[PDB]
Structures are given as C-alpha cells and as structure tokens.
Amino acid sequence: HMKTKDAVAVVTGGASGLGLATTKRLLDAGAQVVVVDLRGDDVVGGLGDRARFAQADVTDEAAVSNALELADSLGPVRVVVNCAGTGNAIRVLSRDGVFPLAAFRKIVDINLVGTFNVLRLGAERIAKTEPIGEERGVIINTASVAAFDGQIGQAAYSASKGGVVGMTLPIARDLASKLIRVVTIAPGLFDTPLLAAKASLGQQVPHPSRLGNPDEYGALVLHIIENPMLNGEVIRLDGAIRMAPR
Amino acid sequence: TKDAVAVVTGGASGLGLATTKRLLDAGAQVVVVDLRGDDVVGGLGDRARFAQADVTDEAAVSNALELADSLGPVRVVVNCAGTGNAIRVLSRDGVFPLAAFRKIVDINLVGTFNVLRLGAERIAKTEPIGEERGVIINTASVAAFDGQIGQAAYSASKGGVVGMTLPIARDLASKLIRVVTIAPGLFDTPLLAAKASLGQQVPHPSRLGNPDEYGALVLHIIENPMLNGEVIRLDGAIRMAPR
Numbered sequence: 001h002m003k004t005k006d007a008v009a010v011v012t013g014g015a016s017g018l019g020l021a022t023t024k025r026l027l028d029a030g031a032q033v034v035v036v037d038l039r040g041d042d043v044v045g046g047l048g049d050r051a052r053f054a055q056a057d058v059t060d061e062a063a064v065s066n067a068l069e070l071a072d073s074l075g076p077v078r079v080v081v082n083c084a085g086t087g088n089a090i091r092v093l094s095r096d097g098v099f100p101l102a103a104f105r106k107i108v109d110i111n112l113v114g115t116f117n118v119l120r121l122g123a124e125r126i127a128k129t130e131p132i133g134e135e136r137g138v139i140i141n142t143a144s145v146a147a148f149d150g151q152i153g154q155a156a157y158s159a160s161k162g163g164v165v166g167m168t169l170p171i172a173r174d175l176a177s178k179l180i181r182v183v184t185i186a187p188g189l190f191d192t193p194l195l196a197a198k199a200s201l202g203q204q205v206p207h208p209s210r211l212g213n214p215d216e217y218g219a220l221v222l223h224i225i226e227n228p229m230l231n232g233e234v235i236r237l238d239g240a241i242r243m244a245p246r
Numbered sequence: 247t248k249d250a251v252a253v254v255t256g257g258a259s260g261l262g263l264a265t266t267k268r269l270l271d272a273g274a275q276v277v278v279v280d281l282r283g284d285d286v287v288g289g290l291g292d293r294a295r296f297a298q299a300d301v302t303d304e305a306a307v308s309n310a311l312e313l314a315d316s317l318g319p320v321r322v323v324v325n326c327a328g329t330g331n332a333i334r335v336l337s338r339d340g341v342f343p344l345a346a347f348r349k350i351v352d353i354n355l356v357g358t359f360n361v362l363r364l365g366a367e368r369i370a371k372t373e374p375i376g377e378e379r380g381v382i383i384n385t386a387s388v389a390a391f392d393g394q395i396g397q398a399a400y401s402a403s404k405g406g407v408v409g410m411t412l413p414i415a416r417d418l419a420s421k422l423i424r425v426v427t428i429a430p431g432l433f434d435t436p437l438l439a440a441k442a443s444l445g446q447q448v449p450h451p452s453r454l455g456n457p458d459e460y461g462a463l464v465l466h467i468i469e470n471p472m473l474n475g476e477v478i479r480l481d482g483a484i485r486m487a488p489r
C-alpha cells in the first residue's frame with residue numbers, strides 16, 4: 001500500500017457510482033481521500049475522518065485548484081482518479097433537428113476537458129512530492145467501451161471518451177520522467193445512478209451476465225495503483241461485451 | 247484462490263514461476279506444466295506439483311490435467327510456456343525458413359490453444375462458486391501490436407493469441423469461464439538470457455519488469471469478475487520501435 005497509506009488521493013465524481021466505490025476502496029487501503037464533485041457532501045460525511053469533500057466543477061480551474069490545496073494540506077498527493085462525467089444520447093439527424101452543437105460541446109467539456117483539467121493540476125501536485133522508491137504517483141482516467149464500440153446516439157459521448165483514450169499514451173510519455181503513471185479504464189455496463197430493463201441490459205453481457213458492481217471498478221483502480229508496470233494503457237472492464245448499434 | 251487448483255504452463259521459470267508463487271501464496275494448489283524444472287518446483291512445497299509436458303503434446307497435457315483434477319476442482323489455467331525468435335524475412339543466407347515459422351506458431355499459439363481447450367474441459371465440469379467456474383489467462387506480448395524487425399513468427403504467434411481471446415471468451419461464457427490475455431513488455435526473465443540499456447527505453451518505470459508484477463496482474467484478473475475478453479498491455483508505456 002506504498003502509494004496509499006500516508007498519501008492522499010483525489011477522486012473526481014467521488015460521491016456517486018464508480019467514483020464512490022473507488023473512494024471507499026482507497027479509504028480501506030489507508031489513503032486520505034478528497035472527493036471532488038458538484039454534490040455529495042452528505043454521502044462523503046458518512047465515510048469517516050479520512051475523507052473530505054470539495055465542491056468543484058472539474059471544468060473550473062480555480063475550484064479544482066482550491067480542492068487541491070485541501071488535498072495537499074492533508075499529505076503528499078499521489079493518486080488522482082477522474083470519474084466525474086455525464087452522457088447524452090442524441091441522433092445526428094432527427095425530425096426535431098440536427099444534434100445541437102452546444103450539447104456536443106458540453107459533453108466534451110465535462111468528460112474530456114474536465115479530465116484533462118484535473119489531470120494537469122493533479123500532476124503538478126504529485127510532481128512536487130518526494131519519490132517513494134521509483135514512483136511519485138499515478139493518475140487513473142475513466143473512458144468507456146463507447147470509445148471503441150460507440151452506439152447510435154453516442155456521437156458526443158464517444159468523442160469525449162475517445163479523446164480520453166487518445167491522450168493516455170502521450171500524457172504517460174510526457175509525465176514519465178517525473179515518475180507519474182497514467183492509465184485509463186474503459187468500463188462496460190455498471191450499476192450506477194448513470195443508468196437512472198436494467199435486468200435485460202445485464203443479460204447482454206457475455207460473462208458475468210449482469211451489470212458491473214462499482215466495487216469491481218474500484219478494485220481495478222487499486223490494482224493499477226499497486227502494479228508499477230501498468231502505464232500508458234487502456235483496460236476494458238466489461239464482461240467481454242461489445243456494444244451493438246442499438 | 248484457496249481450495250482451488252491452478253495449472254501454470256511454463257511455471258518453472260520466468261513469468262510462469264512468479265505466477266506459480268503468487269498462486270501458492272494465495273492458497274491454491276498449483277500444477278506446473280513445463281519441459282523441465284522438477285528441481286525448481288520441488289522447492290515450492292507440498293501444494294505445488296510438477297508435470298513434465300510439451301504444451302503441444304495433447305497426451306502429456308491431459309496427464310497433467312488428470313493430476314490437477316485429482317487435487318480438487320480446476321479453476322485457473324495460465325499459459326506462460328513459450329519461446330522467442332528473431333529471424334529476418336530475407337537475409338544473406340536465405341529466406342526465413344518455413345519450419346522455423348511453424349515451430350514458433352506451434353509452441354506459442356497452438357500450444358496455448360491446446361492447454362486452453364483441455365483446461366476448459368476440466369473447468370467446465372466443476373460446480374460454479376457463485377457466478378463463476380473459472381478463468382483462463384494467456385500470455386501474448388506487446389509484439390502482437392509493436393512487432394520489430396525479426397519478429398515475423400513471434401508476432402504472428404502472439405497476434406493469434408490476441409485474436410482468439412474474444413471468440414473464446416464468447417464461446418465459454420455460458421459455462422462461466424472467463425478468458426483474458428496479458429501482453430507483457432520487457433521482463434527480466436531467462437528469456438532474455440545490454441539489458442540495462444533496454445530497460446532505459448521503457449518510459450516509466452525505466453527498467454525491466456519484475457516477473458512478480460506479471461503474477462500480481464494474473465491474481466487481479468482471477469479476483470476481478472468483470473475482466474473478460476480483453477488484452478492488457480503490461481509494459482511501462484513502451485512502444486517497441488523497429489529495432
């Protein structure tokens with residue numbers, strides 16, 4: 001637990017869904033965790049005195065920087081997990097009109113720009129730490145199988161997640177000399193509030209034929225933290241599903 | 247992992263040995279399947295057994311699986327046996343020999359399929375524990391994606407391992423058997439029997455992989471029910487250049 005015990009993690013989207021499960025796994029591994037989210041202070045307040053909540057939109061650099069002052073005050077920042085995100089499902093062409101430009105921009109801004117914003121500012125905080133052996137820290141991003149298998153309606157969602165995939169390797173290369181790994185998880189179908197018919201959804205997953213449990217995402221995050229050789233890679237976490245057009 | 251039986255090919259050396267040790271530490275009984283290494287495996291204690299077999303020999307592999315089945319329910323199969331190769335397509339002394347290409351494909355690709363298919367037959371006979379009967383983990387290589395000059399046969403064999411991962415996961419899904427492939431980058435094993443400068447080319451960590459890091463990923467795959475039908479590069483972010 002070298003990069004968690006006595007260290008600080010920042011989890012965006014950490015008050016719900018995949019981020020909440022990750023927060024819990026990190027706390028169980030001994031880290032202090034700053035949850036960065038639009039909302040969820042009550043949930044995070046039930047997680048004990050090693051968790052803190054920072055209200056911030058990941059697309060707002062001043063709010064993210066303020067959250068990172070809090071994180072730094074707790075100890076050396078060594079883990080950043082980008083789970084904040086949203087989706088839409090809109091056809092390119094419809095009788096109602098063309099996919100609105102502002103809707104495409106919004107999804108790209110939150111999912112792609114917001115991830116880069118927290119990554120770049122978080123990397124600055126990790127880079128100033130003393131190495132523990134050969135490592136300063138690790139940044140984990142959330143893409144989606146939609147980066148590869150995008151369905152009808154997913155133009156903006158897939159663009160945003162494809163951007164997260166595409167930037168993983170250059171950022172890993174860029175941060176390598178500072179001893180910061182960068183890895184991306186591409187989840188398949190998980191039982192989170194994002195899916196707020198769910199049973200028939202899970203039947204389409206080859207095996208296990210169910211929605212993913214958010215704790216399985218958190219477990220993979222922890223393995224990435226603990227495995228020094230995982231870097232510059234995207235890992236599908238998806239029960240072998242491949243998403244069909246519909 | 248406890249109470250279950252695992253089979254590790256290539257388990258007497260390198261990545262397979264580190265995997266065997268991790269599985270034994272997790273409480274499993276392990277049958278090591280290898281061309282040699284009785285002495286190495288004898289030092290691993292009572293929960294490890296050695297079965298001599300060429301992975302391309304279906305009778306010898308079946309005999310190893312009979313031993314495994316006699317210990318308990320077979321739930322984990324790890325394919326680490328393999329060999330490397332570096333021959334140019336054209337060179338002064340002639341064309342890459344067809345027999346050399348066949349040999350690497352036979353050991354690395356056909357041998358992996360042989361152990362996978364016979365291992366799956368044993369896993370499928372077990373009772374599920376919750377939602378799973380077992381998991382099969384294969385070893386590809388970054389050469390499946392980044393093949394260098396000289397690697398025509400090695401990359402062909404490892405690209406075949408990658409290509410068959412999804413259809414086999416789909417095929418075995420109703421029997422509750424996951425299939426995942428690891429694609430290692432550069433690891434400090436007897437396969438590499440100059441190494442310092444090789445490690446310097448890995449972005450981060452800038453060293454050869456420790457076989458235990460491969461074993462750790464194997465154990466995570468076993469413990470994470472959602473990993474299935476996927477290939478995972480384990481490589482320090484390296485991308486192999488032509489030379």
Ligand SMILES: NC(=O)c1ccc[n+]([C@@H]2O[C@H](COP(=O)([O-])OP(=O)(O)OC[C@H]3O[C@@H](n4cnc5c(N)ncnc54)[C@H](O)[C@@H]3O)[C@@H](O)[C@H]2O)c1
Nearest residue numbers: 013016017018037038057058084085144189190192193194
């Ligand atoms: N659940 C799935 O099936 C699934 C599949 C593929 C990818 N994902 C991705 O996983 C990540 C987590 O989603 P989830 O399923 O946990 O959903 P979720 O809605 O439960 O959690 C997302 C969290 O992000 C927060 N958030 C949203 N926009 C934000 C912003 N601008 N700034 C700060 N916080 C913000 C939300 O308030 C929420 O707490 C997302 O990136 C999502 O796209 C989820």
Ligand SMILES: NC(=O)c1ccc[n+]([C@@H]2O[C@H](COP(=O)([O-])OP(=O)(O)OC[C@H]3O[C@@H](n4cnc5c(N)ncnc54)[C@H](O)[C@@H]3O)[C@@H](O)[C@H]2O)c1
Nearest residue numbers: 256259260261280281300301327328387432433435436437
């Ligand atoms: N070491 C690396 O840098 C590296 C990189 C990418 C992939 N790999 C792959 O990882 C796997 C493990 O290799 P390693 O590095 O541990 O090498 P290794 O030589 O240390 O171990 C391989 C083992 O497989 C056994 N073996 C070979 N052919 C066999 C056969 N026909 N039947 C049974 N056993 C056989 C050998 O006796 C040996 O014990 C191989 O598939 C290799 O191609 C290794």
